[PDB]
Design an enzyme around this catalytic site. Sequence first.
Site, PDB file in Angstrom:
ATOM      1  N   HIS A   1      43.090  45.253  31.832  1.00 21.51           N
ATOM      2  CA  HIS A   1      42.120  44.173  31.718  1.00 21.51           C
ATOM      3  C   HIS A   1      41.042  44.305  32.794  1.00 21.51           C
ATOM      4  O   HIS A   1      41.380  44.513  33.968  1.00 21.51           O
ATOM      5  CB  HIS A   1      42.876  42.803  31.812  1.00 21.51           C
ATOM      6  CG  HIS A   1      41.932  41.610  32.054  1.00 21.51           C
ATOM      7  ND1 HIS A   1      41.989  40.847  33.164  1.00 21.51           N
ATOM      8  CD2 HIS A   1      40.879  41.118  31.295  1.00 21.51           C
ATOM      9  CE1 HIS A   1      41.030  39.906  33.112  1.00 21.51           C
ATOM     10  NE2 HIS A   1      40.357  40.048  31.960  1.00 21.51           N
ATOM     11  N   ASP A   2      39.755  44.248  32.380  1.00 18.09           N
ATOM     12  CA  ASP A   2      38.599  44.484  33.259  1.00 18.09           C
ATOM     13  C   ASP A   2      38.885  45.717  34.141  1.00 18.09           C
ATOM     14  O   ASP A   2      38.897  45.648  35.412  1.00 18.09           O
ATOM     15  CB  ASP A   2      38.367  43.238  34.143  1.00 18.09           C
ATOM     16  CG  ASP A   2      37.464  42.228  33.493  1.00 18.09           C
ATOM     17  OD1 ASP A   2      36.608  42.647  32.687  1.00 18.09           O
ATOM     18  OD2 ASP A   2      37.555  41.045  33.859  1.00 18.09           O
TER      19      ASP A   2
ATOM     20  N   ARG B   1      33.745  45.408  30.357  1.00 19.40           N
ATOM     21  CA  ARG B   1      32.864  44.271  30.120  1.00 19.40           C
ATOM     22  C   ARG B   1      31.606  44.530  30.988  1.00 19.40           C
ATOM     23  O   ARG B   1      31.690  45.055  32.112  1.00 19.40           O
ATOM     24  CB  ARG B   1      33.579  42.928  30.432  1.00 19.40           C
ATOM     25  CG  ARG B   1      35.017  42.804  29.839  1.00 19.40           C
ATOM     26  CD  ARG B   1      35.634  41.403  30.002  1.00 19.40           C
ATOM     27  NE  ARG B   1      36.986  41.465  29.413  1.00 19.40           N
ATOM     28  CZ  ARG B   1      37.620  40.451  28.824  1.00 19.40           C
ATOM     29  NH1 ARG B   1      37.058  39.252  28.749  1.00 19.40           N
ATOM     30  NH2 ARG B   1      38.810  40.663  28.282  1.00 19.40           N
TER      31      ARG B   1
ATOM     32  N   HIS C   1      32.744  41.948  36.042  1.00 18.17           N
ATOM     33  CA  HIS C   1      33.635  40.868  35.717  1.00 18.17           C
ATOM     34  C   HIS C   1      32.712  39.671  35.801  1.00 18.17           C
ATOM     35  O   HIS C   1      32.292  39.284  36.891  1.00 18.17           O
ATOM     36  CB  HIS C   1      34.754  40.757  36.749  1.00 18.17           C
ATOM     37  CG  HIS C   1      35.640  39.566  36.555  1.00 18.17           C
ATOM     38  ND1 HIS C   1      36.937  39.668  36.103  1.00 18.17           N
ATOM     39  CD2 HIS C   1      35.413  38.245  36.752  1.00 18.17           C
ATOM     40  CE1 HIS C   1      37.473  38.462  36.029  1.00 18.17           C
ATOM     41  NE2 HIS C   1      36.569  37.581  36.417  1.00 18.17           N
TER      42      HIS C   1
ATOM     43  N   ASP D   1      46.749  43.116  33.817  1.00 19.52           N
ATOM     44  CA  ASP D   1      46.228  43.270  35.162  1.00 19.52           C
ATOM     45  C   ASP D   1      47.120  44.180  36.029  1.00 19.52           C
ATOM     46  O   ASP D   1      48.380  44.258  35.807  1.00 19.52           O
ATOM     47  CB  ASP D   1      46.127  41.873  35.816  1.00 19.52           C
ATOM     48  CG  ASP D   1      44.934  41.078  35.314  1.00 19.52           C
ATOM     49  OD1 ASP D   1      44.049  41.672  34.677  1.00 19.52           O
ATOM     50  OD2 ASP D   1      44.917  39.856  35.495  1.00 19.52           O
TER      51      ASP D   1
END
Length: 302
Positions: free
Chosen positions: A29-30, A66, A79, A280
């Site tokens: 994630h990210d 992102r 982010h 994460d």
Amino acid sequence: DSLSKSPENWMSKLDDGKHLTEINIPGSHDSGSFTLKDPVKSVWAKTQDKDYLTQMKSGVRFFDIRGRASADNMISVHHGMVYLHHELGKFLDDAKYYLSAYPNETIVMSMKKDYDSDSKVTKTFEEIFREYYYNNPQYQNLFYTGSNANPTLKETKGKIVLFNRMGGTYIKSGYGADTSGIQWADNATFETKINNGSLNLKVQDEYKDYYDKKVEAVKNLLAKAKTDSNKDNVYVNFLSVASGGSAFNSTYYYASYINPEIAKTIKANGKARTGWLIVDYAGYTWPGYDDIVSEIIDSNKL
């Protein structure tokens, strides 16, 4: 040895007649937030500590990028408001390098606009991505360009497959690559058809949950993948959760609980379909606790 003892080339050991949807894939994630060092901002803004190549070597194959358009020919990795100190070309170069060294792995790259464009920008985020990255001769051959709505490991390995969270696109290859894009529900478990109705996408992305509800939401979608053998169904299950802010517990603190909780659950299910699980602090281990990336990897059938 199990697949997770060789996380650098685990997809090479699978049957490549499998559709990517049917493979249990660890994502981060990210992914790009490994650059963050500020200890206050990192409570909420930082989600990884390993760089892209180290994540790949650790077995991560789904990358959640992102971004923000910072110029008519540039996407900055973000982010939210927070710049992650590099542009999209950095990720793509790292990916290209990895895939040349491990050519029987596929990478799926989610692409999303996370913040408003630089005020000098004149083009949409989707035009910038399409014209300056996807169709850039510099990345010729790197991206999946085939016309299969549900591609197999064989036609995608050695390439990056777009997972499109930009909205409508003129790009025609990858998940959600049509002029509707993907209808994402905010902070929700949801399902939606993608690729002109060819696929049923099932998402758990309840990113503002507190950790008890987060674990329940993860496990609920995990339980649905387990009994679902339909290759036209695609599961994306985010274990990641927001911090409430810098006064509050960090994203790392939550992941330090959720990851081993979910890893223990997957391991006790044995070889069973999970979907794509996005975490994460991918590759972050705690002595005495199952590792979520390894357990996702070992949940695949040989």
